Amino acid sequence: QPAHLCFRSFVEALKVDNDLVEINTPIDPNLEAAAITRRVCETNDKAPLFNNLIGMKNGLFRILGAPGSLRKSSADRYGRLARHLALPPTASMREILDKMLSASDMPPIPPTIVPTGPCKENSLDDSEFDLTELPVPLIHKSDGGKYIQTYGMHIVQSPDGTWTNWSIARAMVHDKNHLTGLVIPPQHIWQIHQMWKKEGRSDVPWALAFGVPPAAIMASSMPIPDGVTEAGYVGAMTGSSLELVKCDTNDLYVPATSEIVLEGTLSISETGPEGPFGEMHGYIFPGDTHLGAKYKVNRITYRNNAIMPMSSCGRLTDETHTMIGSLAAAEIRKLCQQNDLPITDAFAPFESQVTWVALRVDTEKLRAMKTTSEGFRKRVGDVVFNHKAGYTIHRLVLVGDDIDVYEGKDVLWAFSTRCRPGMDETLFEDVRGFPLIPYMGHGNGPAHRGGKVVSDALMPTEYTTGRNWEAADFNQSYPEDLKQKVLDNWTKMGFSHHHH
Amino acid sequence: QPAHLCFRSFVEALKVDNDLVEINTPIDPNLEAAAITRRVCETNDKAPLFNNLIGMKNGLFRILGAPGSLRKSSADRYGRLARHLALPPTASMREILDKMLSASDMPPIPPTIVPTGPCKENSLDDSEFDLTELPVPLIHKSDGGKYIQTYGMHIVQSPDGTWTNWSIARAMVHDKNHLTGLVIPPQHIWQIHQMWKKEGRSDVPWALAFGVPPAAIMASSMPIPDGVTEAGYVGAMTGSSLELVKCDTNDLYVPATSEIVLEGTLSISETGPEGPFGEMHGYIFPGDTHLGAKYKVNRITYRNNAIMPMSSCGRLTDETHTMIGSLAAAEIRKLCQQNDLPITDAFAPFESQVTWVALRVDTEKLRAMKTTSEGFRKRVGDVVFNHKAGYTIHRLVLVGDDIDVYEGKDVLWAFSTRCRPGMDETLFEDVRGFPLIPYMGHGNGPAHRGGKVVSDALMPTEYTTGRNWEAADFNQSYPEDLKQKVLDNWTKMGFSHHHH
Ligand SMILES: Cc1cc2c3c(c1C)C(C)(C)C[C@@H](O)N3c1c(nc(O)[nH]c1=O)N2C[C@H](O)[C@H](O)[C@H](O)COP(=O)(O)O
Ligand SMILES: Cc1cc2c3c(c1C)C(C)(C)C[C@@H](O)N3c1c(nc(O)[nH]c1=O)N2C[C@H](O)[C@H](O)[C@H](O)COP(=O)(O)O
Ligand SMILES: O=C(O)c1cc2ccccc2s1
């Protein structure tokens, strides 16, 4: 089966790409696996596959770290993401995000039910497993638990059956048969949980599938619209109906090739200690004492020689930057266009710790709008910061057509030189805020409200008559024929490969 | 003579460092020299020495580009700056800035007058030169003139004789015997000009010396205090009295080894067209039509085989970033400390286009102050933004002791994650603004006022009880013995030199 449709094939693809290091000597899930993975992510090294994990028994489990992190080379920087999607490994960010958006105006392709699959090769009932006895990693030394769930997909369905959501949300082992995790507004797992809580009759049927089809984990990380079943969106994106098997103990459906499946319930009444956790912005607050949602595990099924993917998240660069930031930016681009805003491109700069999104403006269309910075900033912020797709993003930077928003250096240049602090900005205090950002949840103001800004890095004439500058750079401040001469004579005059 | 005391020896030092490319074939001062230099600056290549400049006659002149720009290697990144100062080429920014500050609590060492020097090897009177006939560069294709003056030192003295200022300010050829240039508040050349204008009796005696002692051009670029004669400050910094010769046509004194000296007057009445110019923030606004100060040239003296240094300024990285930003940051650090503010370090991040300065706070001392963000931000902004040293800087970022302000990635991380937009900031609208920043002089508000901000990236407990987080990074989220094991086994597990 293709790499984008089968996690085991994706691992093979990384190996074939010379993008994998197979560690076959014993590695401790207590910090060592995650430390190696952290070092990989900080240096853009090859993904580690831990084939000999201390505490692995009866097939549970190996670990793959850094599944969606960056490669060192510029030419295939995003190759791991491209391998989630059947794209060439040289694909640009624009191409990856366009692939992730492509299903937004296609008919869904609903999934296909099959009678079995590799995820049924092994099973453990309610008397045969103990989650405290599995080689669950301690990912950061001050974490409040062993975070089994950093790269699996939670599966929950609305009470009426009409919406099945797939999403990533963290979870850690609470005891032999329970997890605790984040279930917070406005996330779809929270929205669906609220539906079950208002109905009041039962706990939420739940499954958590690890090592799912890579195209599915991508959509799990993306804020596609309310009410949209990720399985059918992935089907449309890939052109293929995803094959799903029924859970043994409930009527949810999991990908047939899932590496590991937990089946059980998400409580509508119980909570338990959750966190702290070393999180996407680069921090952990040791001892934070929060309550989280509580999940009961009734069954585990798994592939022979199962592999658990793991995100050792924190400082740059890991899945929480490459996937959360970029996929939110993609959805924000679409949202803006659907609201008749002249946005061509969006990206969350890594330098901002993916807390900013830069929005590239088609300034010809902006000029025809005959508007002003104050008005336009307000309109953009209202659209984005009032929507779920804007949840994680605290600063929007508007830039004109000369800026490549996928290049953080150029975003930083434009922000720093074209946006006058205060005057060229609009603050939003009455919007939902993202409490995980330290200056929110551990800051001076309300953890859940405000702290957002639209920073207009459009210059005045971009609203009126057109750009009125040239850059003082090699590209723009010298004629073509001179630039070419300089390049052609560079080495010969004495000065200093694409792939490398 | 030592490299830091003699420009000709500095050129030799760059050659010996394998940091020079001697171009001995004809190069056009119309754009080509500057284009090569621009490419060097954008790629951190070796400095170009143009030994065969189309239009060079009777010794005037060769060009050295990129004299204070960056080297490619991390290990000697700042080596060209270190060679201005007799420091090892591996010197850190902290070491360079500490050297530039060292004279601030030393007695000046006044200069020594000598009867002659190399700058007297050749002369041209008022009938023998024409500035339009020299190989003055066109640096950017839309510049409003040929900018002879990008890396020389203007010399002007107060009417009472008590203060002789050395500073860099741009100037371009107006006609055969005049320049126009920037003379703007609060700069010392402007302050002294105002003194002469209030006296009303004569034009300002003036000299402009190119290819001065490197330690002198550094101080020329630094906002040392009002009334302080740069020559004596450089003397104290270097431990050596600088040797100066008298001008032929006035009673000013120039460095004895200056490559080229212009002698004349800065008018207290006349102006002429000046600019536009491709400037430090990366822009030119073609056609801008400003009036600037007008200089009359009465005499040229020069060394045999004179070399004109040139800054091809614009987008990162050139002398306008390495010298303007860093030296302003140094002075701001000292200013803060003199005002009893607990600042240990300051740097202008390149990523900010040197419009920000990050201020590292000694948070133990901050805690003892028993203050708050609002109060502390206001105090810091008042000190800095009301002072000349803060002129060019529009955003101050306060960071705690864990942040290395000389590392832009870490400044950006702290700003993006620790400063809540709006709430954690104080805007300053009633301070002098820097009109050269596009969002000022070509923006939506007053060109010369406001647009400044203090952004507090200190976390709340840094004011009270101490840092309450650990970073989610390899360094902080794993114990020492594990980190060392990972590093020691890195290659052997399959993963990937200081100088490279
Ligand atoms: C890629 C990825 C995404 C997420 C997370 C991680 C990764 C690797 C963790 C390492 C596990 C850290 C974790 O903080 N985490 C996480 C999370 N969203 C939450 O509500 N809770 C979480 O704990 N998202 C983001 C969500 O996946 C997206 O916001 C998605 O849009 C949600 O799907 P939906 O609600 O739109 O269907
Ligand atoms: C290093 C360097 C410094 C400056 C400049 C350049 C370089 C290379 C140019 C390429 C020529 C561009 C130019 O815009 N320019 C420049 C300038 N200051 C001005 O008033 N006017 C200028 O046109 N400074 C900055 C000043 O040199 C410092 O602000 C210094 O502090 C002044 O000295 P003082 O008034 O404190 O004595
Ligand atoms: O653990 C963390 O990094 C995260 C928790 C959340 C919650 C919601 C959205 C993104 C993330 S990222």
Ligand SMILES: O=C(O)c1cc2ccccc2s1
């Ligand atoms: O030409 C430009 O880059 C500059 C003009 C000025 C004026 C004052 C201070 C710095 C600079 S930098």
Ligand SMILES: [K+]
């Ligand atoms: K999703």
Ligand SMILES: [K+]
């Ligand atoms: K603007």
Ligand SMILES: [K+]
């Ligand atoms: K100076």
Ligand SMILES: [K+]
């Ligand atoms: K703060």
Ligand SMILES: [Mn+2]
């Ligand atoms: Mn969803």
Ligand SMILES: [Mn+2]
């Ligand atoms: Mn001065």
